[PDB]
Amino acid sequence: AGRTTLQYPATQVSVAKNLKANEPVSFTYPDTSSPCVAVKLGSPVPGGVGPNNDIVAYSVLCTHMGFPTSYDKSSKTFKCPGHFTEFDAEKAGQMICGQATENLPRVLLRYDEASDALTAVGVDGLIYGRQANVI
Amino acid sequence: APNDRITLPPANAQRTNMTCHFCIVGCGYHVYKWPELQEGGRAPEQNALGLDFRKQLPPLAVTLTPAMTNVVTEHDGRRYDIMVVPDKACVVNSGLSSTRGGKMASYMYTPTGDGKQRLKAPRLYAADQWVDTTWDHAMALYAGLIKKTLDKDGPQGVFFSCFDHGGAGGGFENTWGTGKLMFSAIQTPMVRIHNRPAYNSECHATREMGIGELNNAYEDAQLADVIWSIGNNPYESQTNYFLNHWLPNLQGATTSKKKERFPNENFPQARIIFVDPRETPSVAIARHVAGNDRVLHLAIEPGTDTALFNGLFTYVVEQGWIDKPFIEAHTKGFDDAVKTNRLSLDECSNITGVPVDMLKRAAEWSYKPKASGQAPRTMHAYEKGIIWGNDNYVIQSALLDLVIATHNVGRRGTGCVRMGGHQEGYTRPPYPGDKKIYIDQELIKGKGRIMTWWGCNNFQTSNNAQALREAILQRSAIVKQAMQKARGATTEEMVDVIYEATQNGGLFVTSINLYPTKLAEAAHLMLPAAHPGEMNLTSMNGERRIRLSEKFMDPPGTAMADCLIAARIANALRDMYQKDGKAEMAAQFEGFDWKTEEDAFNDGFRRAGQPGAPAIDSQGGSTGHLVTYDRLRKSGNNGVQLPVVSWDESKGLVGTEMLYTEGKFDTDDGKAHFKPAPWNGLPATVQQQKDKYRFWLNNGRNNEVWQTAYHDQYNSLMQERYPMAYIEMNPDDCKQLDVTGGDIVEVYNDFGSTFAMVYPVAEIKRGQTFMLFGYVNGIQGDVTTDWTDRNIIPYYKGTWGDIRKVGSMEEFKRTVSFKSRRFA
Amino acid sequence: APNDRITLPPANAQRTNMTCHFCIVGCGYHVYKWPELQEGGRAPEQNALGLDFRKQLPPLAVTLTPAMTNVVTEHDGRRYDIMVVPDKACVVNSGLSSTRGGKMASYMYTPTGDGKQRLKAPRLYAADQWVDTTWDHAMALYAGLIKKTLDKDGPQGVFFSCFDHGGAGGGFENTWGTGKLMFSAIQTPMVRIHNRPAYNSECHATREMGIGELNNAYEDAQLADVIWSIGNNPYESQTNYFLNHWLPNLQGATTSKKKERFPNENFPQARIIFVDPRETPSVAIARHVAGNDRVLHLAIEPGTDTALFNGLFTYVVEQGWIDKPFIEAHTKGFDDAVKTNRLSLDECSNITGVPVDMLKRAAEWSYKPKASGQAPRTMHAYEKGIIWGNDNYVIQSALLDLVIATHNVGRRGTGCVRMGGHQEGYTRPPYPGDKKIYIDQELIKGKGRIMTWWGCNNFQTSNNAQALREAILQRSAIVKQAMQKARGATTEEMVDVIYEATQNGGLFVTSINLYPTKLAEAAHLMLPAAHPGEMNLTSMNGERRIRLSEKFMDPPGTAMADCLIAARIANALRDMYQKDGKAEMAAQFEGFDWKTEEDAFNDGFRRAGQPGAPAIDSQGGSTGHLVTYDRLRKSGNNGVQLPVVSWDESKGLVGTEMLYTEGKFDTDDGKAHFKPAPWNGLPATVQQQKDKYRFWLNNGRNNEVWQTAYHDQYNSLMQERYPMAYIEMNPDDCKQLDVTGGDIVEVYNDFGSTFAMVYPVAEIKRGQTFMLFGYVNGIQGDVTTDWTDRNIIPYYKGTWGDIRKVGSMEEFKRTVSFKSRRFA
């Protein structure tokens, strides 16, 4: 008891300089049943990380009814094939149009300048299909 | 607070039924309620959802987010978790939730949530400030003014604009309560409806032709060969009808069922035709699902619907793609309509702008006999693009002609239906006047002493809204100034002061509402109302399916169900007249001895057509008495489609799936009647705006935003996404005006001026725009005209204006997505 | 959210300093800020509080509640826990938090919290509706109108009511920015102050006599033999000064320290005297702490303070309980004041209603020599009972005469001081006119083109507030009506339309605020401001202790520090004049090249008295330049008492504890000057209300409610406790009017009408009442008169009226406590 926060793991994703502009990387966080994407957007956005403050990461499970969304490089969005929700990767997962009542959850990355490491350390929002982000 | 977990409902949590508060579809939901300091276990048999939260859930297993949860604080001060989630076994939605219904838990009243500014007590503008007042004082002032007006001017001095709809802020209890009050007790004809400025119908023509506008089932959309969506953006406006019924048809998942019902009939891949000037999200999504070859977008010129349907009707008649036996046995007027409505494809094409090949293809898909010999089953769905279109009455004449000739009513997989707006829930006395009155014009012209907005906000939603607001604010100010002189007056003296100010151009304004709204800028008196879940409420959806939404919590403060507000008013007025020794006037206010909303159900819906009952117009018809609360509860979220045909304890309520299947229509002779539909171009008032100004100012709904945003204006996610009403503009037009996404523009014409944030949209045609209607920041209706059809139905979609850059809102550019809302 | 736990700050959490936003005392706080998904451990070395949460904490170990926590969302979208708790090591408060300061965390801006409705962008009333607008457009309209007014009418056409105070919505950066803009750049004399309707002082008399009103330290309250609290309810209005300094004295906890400083002086048990018509919570708490025998409540007749002090002065002079060597060496005018102010005890008693024995006792306790030979150390504290009393100037004359003759300035444990309201933070250019102007009267009379309320709301807080609102709303309406006709206008055309409407009686109204407030009923333009924590801010408390409140979070949207709003306006005006080729006018708007608030501190406070500086009036004096943000940070929440005397890197800022200890006053000759103080009764305007109506309408503060409740109106606990302004009434008076707790009454007289909920209070005298001032639901100021003293200081505590039952608010009866607020 005493604890109000979830016990998120710290998972290495990659080093920032490996990431190419607008080429998504796949990983799992906070466990292997939670698919995620990190992407270097190419221009700074609020809360972006890395050397160009432009790296962002998300849970790809649609917050409507949980289908895996796909990243669209032309629009920098995540599209759900289920009922056509679309989320803005440049606006912290803001729903552009769709049937969700929650933004696409952001995976919180630490960027360590010393090592160039990007580490997933938490989640902002509730991942689809879960009582808590950490099962 | 925390964004990364939710409290599960315990296995034994209380569970009640709730219909969605909002749109016509009326999706079914369950409300779980349990004490704040209990919770369910993750094992599936240790929570009320029966879902296994010990590992990741698959897609489609649930719809659950924090927005679907809340903690309420009841009148006993105790705190309860609630969870409002879609019912997987409801036939309407099969466990689907729109983004709007999904937020119901968040928009339940709590002292600290999105509902924080709910009206909790009577509010009085005491000349120069808002204060609280008691219900008794409020009724003394409100009933006192009504009484004074009745005594000296008669009913013609008492004005209302009132909901006539279903769902939240409507329904059978509420429409009866208000209707009985306005029509049987006060007996005023000075009443308009929430969305239209007279006591009229959206569907005069179809009804007069013998076809009530809700004539099918949602299952018919699953059985259709072809669906027309006319003046309609259903993915955004009737989401779960489109997702749960239309799309499965397009995807081929209903083909089995068609072939099982009709063994000797070809069923090609289903196709969909949209008649809409604008390329909408619904067009885009239909093409993604069915392919480009199975979708036809007839991107007509604004206001040309009548010419489209006349050209189609002419063509199917010339091709012989009509049902001659049907016409001969069950219709009147066909031969006349052929002549009056004659229009060649070439002329049709020139007026509508649609190429002849596309007009022919629409007809081929929809009306040319299938190989097995039967006509396609073509369901014709329409909404506000033509209800608020260029001559409501004439467009429906034109469309219904095509439908009747092609036998697309009364066959399964057909129907010529409204898609609907709100849910339906109408039970009222007859309107007491003999003429249609343009209420807004009467108010603008200085008539009436007291005006009540009841469950509506015409400041945001009137046509010619700027003229209305100007006048009401001024008239309101006269009353405020008059009240100002008073000091130490009795309630009765104040009534006299206010009455006198109304002889000098004033108007006393009351609002009965959930929230202050923009009406608070002019209101003198606001009364707190209760919404479903804080009360029992009955309503039906677009296939006439009646459900009970069960009470599960207390209203904020002394908020009350609207039917009980109406009983309170009636009983105040009665007491006043009894005390004044006017027995005959007192008796007009009898029959409001109501303790609960169910009393209003029993007095209204359940008395319709019964012996000893007064005249009652009810969507439940004369078998409404077969419905009780208890019986609805046992039916669940599936309810019963009205009208009820029988009931017994062993089989429950048994209802009606489709109307007109035997060829007997609601006319004197039982036949469907064809009507002439002349093409006269745009109305002069509208054509003048078009001649003077550049842009067609189309307007309507956004998927995420409900109506006047009365809840959404308090929702931080909604406000971040849509801080201001937006206007879709063609990018080439944008460059010409040097605007981009997140700029602010003034939109104006001879009728008014308003503002919007620019939303460049590639799919918008040059010279055309689309602005969100009804909103809290930039009211679109300022630039709509005063023009109405013969029945005082506004052409809300018919206005032109100019656009002027105000400037760049950097904050909107940083926070708002201007990405495309048309999925591909 | 969950109401049964809190998230502890991590051991390594960031910690910044913050002075309480609210009252004069300026208690010190720490702000802990850390990422939302981290937390501290319960072991004391694993959290930033250093407290052991592994077992129950003892009393006094902490002040921590959920209301002292929040989760902010920054401009980068990331979420952070904050915790705002009192600093145990700050000398002012020693870890005390009032109920007001305690809520600071809850009143920080968050998208879903109590700050949800904070202004985030410019708001424009575009003739008939509220919309957002850009900063650029807002400046073009606002500066455009100021420029047009300057060009055609001169400065006399541009009006302001602006804060002059410290803390949130004030302070040295903000008062300089606004004062430079109004006085040096625009150069308008049409300026009033947030709490008074002209550009004047609350303390003209004491200042002119040579005694600035903040002349001691809080430690002096610890060293006193006797404290007078005059026109003052300090438990409620200066809570932690009373709790942390006054009470320890009354309890005997400071006796050692007095005796250590003064080895050969008797120190009896301390005593306390209150001069207040009303028996307050402060009186009751003093009696519980010290006993009845050590508290004297001089329950004077309303408005009789001058007669009281003249009787006391007369008596101590006749007794020889004065300091003749002091008078002879350091004062001027004594002999004259003895003659002008002569009044016998018997006459004093007749006017004040205080019995002669009690007048004698007050003098005996306070001024008769102690056995060891020295005069008692008698600290005379006063506030709004006499600042807003019957002739501000004369009361202060009378009081200061008593104080000077008895040598109760300049000795430790004495002082004749304001208790204060807000904190102090004044640095401004001189006022540019040569006369006092009653701004509200000028507005009512139709003067001015543009009026800006800047961090105040005189709708709720003006004297004769009903007259003000009537006029402003009407004048506002003229402008709205004029704007209405426009369509498609440029900003420059709209400026012309509005200017013309102001020639026809109109007034353009701007509000620069945190919130919409009631001003939104009349404003055309509202601009978003930032409060401490969203900006750096400096201010000083009632002992002149200057502290830096450190920025730790972003403001909502594009909200800005007030000094930077002033720079923005100045730079807009400069550009406009440059563009119009008017080099000389442009240059008046130089000196606002500011990027951050610190720029305003450097340009104002730190330039005062410096070579080549303009004339600057600053509470920092001419050693203000020794203070920097960095030096204040190193000082912590203990700051420095102004004026600073020296600084070096090794000893930090060293300042001034008590003023006047060498007997050199702020006059030409260095002496303190006595003044005549005539007793003229009540002002005729007030006496006429008293003659016509039954109840003395006393008014003022409630402990829990801050000011105009601009935050509290959004706080569900606050609204549940005080849903409506309350009026304390004698129970016998209540029974006569058939009212009890939770009834609503109208309060009225010749000046206006307002409402209140009835709060029976046994301690209220028959024919007297006490109403909460300034509130959001029932504005008290409607019934205050227009009467002001020679310097346009209102007698806000001087009004009479009648009371009429409206009705019983059952909801208030069920939810509001009407139990006693006077502790025993």
Ligand SMILES: Nc1nc2c(c(=O)[nH]1)N[C@H]1C(S)=C(S)[C@@H](COP(=O)(O)OP(=O)(O)OC[C@H]3O[C@@H](n4cnc5c(=O)[nH]c(N)nc54)[C@H](O)[C@@H]3O)O[C@H]1N2
């Ligand atoms: N330009 C233009 N204007 C249009 C349209 C358009 O297409 N173009 N559409 C028209 C149409 S289709 C419509 S439906 C109208 C809508 O116009 P309105 O009816 O004016 O708008 P709503 O937002 O439905 O109004 C519902 C109101 O009732 C309140 N409310 C909610 N629940 C309750 C309840 O239980 N009791 C009470 N007493 N009040 C309640 C809400 O707080 C809100 O103020 O707008 C019309 N206006």
Ligand SMILES: Nc1nc2c(c(=O)[nH]1)N[C@H]1C(S)=C(S)[C@@H](COP(=O)(O)OP(=O)(O)OC[C@H]3O[C@@H](n4cnc5c(=O)[nH]c(N)nc54)[C@H](O)[C@@H]3O)O[C@H]1N2
């Ligand atoms: N998301 C959401 N759903 C809602 C509502 C809401 O507020 N939010 N409100 C509900 C209500 S009360 C209603 S009435 C319904 C309305 O639902 P719809 O009528 O489907 O919606 P609208 O957006 O008003 O208009 C439909 C279409 O009419 C088209 N149109 C405009 N002018 C013409 C024309 O001359 N002819 C033709 N053929 N088409 C034209 C527009 O381009 C628009 O796409 O939606 C309901 N559902």
Ligand SMILES: Nc1nc2c(c(=O)[nH]1)N[C@H]1C(S)=C(S)[C@@H](COP(=O)(O)OP(=O)(O)OC[C@H]3O[C@@H](n4cnc5c(=O)[nH]c(N)nc54)[C@H](O)[C@@H]3O)O[C@H]1N2
């Ligand atoms: N009858 C009666 N009348 C009285 C008194 C009384 O005793 N009796 N008291 C008088 C006294 S002493 C006073 S102090 C006045 C109070 O009169 P006002 O100054 O009008 O009242 P406040 O509540 O202090 O006003 C603060 C306003 O500024 C806003 N605000 C807060 N922080 C900031 C900031 O950083 N920037 C800006 N721009 N705005 C900010 C608040 O939202 C609020 O609208 O009332 C006076 N009126």
Ligand SMILES: Nc1nc2c(c(=O)[nH]1)N[C@H]1C(S)=C(S)[C@@H](COP(=O)(O)OP(=O)(O)OC[C@H]3O[C@@H](n4cnc5c(=O)[nH]c(N)nc54)[C@H](O)[C@@H]3O)O[C@H]1N2
């Ligand atoms: N809780 C809280 N504290 C605050 C504030 C607040 O809003 N809330 N506001 C702050 C501000 S800005 C200020 S100015 C101060 C004001 O602080 P105070 O002046 O202490 O408070 P008030 O309640 O305005 O009035 C003080 C007393 O004057 C008495 N009184 C009335 N008429 C007379 C008279 O003729 N003579 C005498 N001798 N007494 C009289 C009243 O009975 C009342 O108890 O409080 C500050 N502190």
Ligand code: F3S
């Ligand atoms: S959830 Fe509600 S908003 Fe319509 S689509 Fe379903 S009834």
Ligand code: F3S
């Ligand atoms: S906490 Fe704040 S309100 Fe005054 S008593 Fe202390 S400065």
Ligand code: FES
């Ligand atoms: S599951 Fe993604 S939109 Fe429904």
Ligand SMILES: [Mo+4]
């Ligand atoms: Mo509608």
Ligand SMILES: [Mo]
């Ligand atoms: Mo004050």
Ligand code: NA
């Ligand atoms: Na307008």
Ligand code: NA
């Ligand atoms: Na008033």
Ligand SMILES: [O]
């Ligand atoms: O003050």
